Every structure is written in C-alpha cells, then in structure tokens.
Design a protein around this ligand. Structure first.
Ligand SMILES: Nc1nc2c([nH]c(=O)n2[C@H]2C[C@H](O)[C@@H](COP(=O)(O)OP(=O)(O)OP(=O)(O)O)O2)c(=O)[nH]1
Ligand code: NA
Ligand code: NA
Length: 156
C-alpha cells in the first residue's frame, strides 16, 4: 500500500451560496475548488485548514467543522493525497485574490461542477445534505476516474 500525504480542503458554505476559488497555478489549476493545501509539521489538521484558508483566501475563521475525508490516488504517482474536508458558514473578512486562487461566490443552484474536479459531483451533494462522508478516487490524469469508493459515515 502507498504512503499518504495530508491535505486540507475548506468550503465556506452559506445558506444560498458557496465560496470557491479558481486555481491559478499548480495542482488542479483551472478548476474551481475550496481552499487548502499540505498540512505542515506540528499543526493539527484543523489548524492547517484554517491556515490554508487564510493564506489562499485572506479569510479567517475561529472554527471549522470536519465534513469528510477523501483519499486520492493518481496512476503513476507513488503517494496518496489524504484530503481532510472542512466547512464553515461563518467567515471573517472579504476574500482576497492570492497567488493561488481567485475567489468567487456561486449560488447553490449554479455549482460549477463542469469546472470542478470530476469527483466533486459525487461528494459535494452529500456535503449540501449535511451528510458526512469518506471517499477514495483513483484518477488517470486529471479527468478520468478508474475506481472509486464513497460512503456516508456517522463519524468522519
Ligand atoms: N475538490 C477537490 N479537491 C481536491 C481534489 N484533489 C485534491 O488534492 N484536492 C484538494 C486538496 C487541496 O485543497 C488541493 C491540493 O493542494 P495544493 O496542491 O493546492 O497544495 P499546496 O497549497 O500546499 O500546494 P503549493 O501551493 O505548495 O503548490 O486540492 C479533488 O479531486 N477534488
Ligand atoms: Na496553499
Ligand atoms: Na492550495
């Protein structure tokens, strides 16, 4: 089995809109996504999620709620990406374009699935329904899913 590297993903989800960022470079460039990145040495996963939100979007939040976990495997890459997914409804500040991301709000009847990672079509609806989830997706390149597992859980 492969080793895994810890990542976070943060979704700012208000009652009628969600904040996403257009990834301007790096992994997932050209796709709308939540905010996140690698967890660093000695920080808790939640604190790494708060840090990444602030670094990429300029937003601070006092607390985050863990909503899911997704493991990503890419053909031809030796490590798994273990993504810990968090949500908040309560933000401080206005989003700021960073080098990584251009933030934009989307109404919840206009979730830009065609411009998001393909797996998001599977798990994002669960997030909207307040259902915690564990997932795993194997990709060949950026577009093609070869295998995946998704399950609702009571405890993330
Ligand atoms: N929505 C979604 N997010 C994903 C998928 N795969 C995946 O790694 N992510 C998230 C986890 C992280 O938020 C981000 C990947 O982290 P990153 O490469 O931006 O990390 P970083 O900020 O530390 O990278 P860098 O600035 O050092 O280049 O994408 C996916 O299929 N769907
Ligand atoms: Na980052
Ligand atoms: Na990032």
């Amino acid at each position: 089995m492969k080793a895994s590297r810890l990542y976070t993903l943060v979704l700012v989800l208000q009652p009628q809109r969600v904040l996403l960022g257009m990834k301007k470079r790096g992994f997932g460039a050209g796709r709308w996504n939540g905010f996140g990145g690698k967890v660093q040495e000695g920080e808790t996963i939640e604190d790494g999620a708060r840090r990444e939100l602030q670094e990429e979007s300029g937003l601070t939040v006092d607390a985050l709620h863990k909503v899911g976990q997704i493991v990503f495997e890419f053909v031809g890459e030796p490590e798994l990406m273990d993504v810990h997914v968090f949500a908040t409804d309560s933000i401080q500040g206005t989003p700021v374009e960073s080098d990584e991301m251009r933030p934009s709000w989307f109404q919840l009847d206009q979730i830009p699935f065609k411009d998001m990672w393909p797996d998001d079509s599977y798990w994002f609806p669960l997030l909207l329904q307040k259902k915690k989830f564990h997932g795993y997706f194997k990709f060949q390149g950026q577009d093609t899913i070869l295998d995946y597992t998704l399950r609702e859980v009571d405890t993330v």
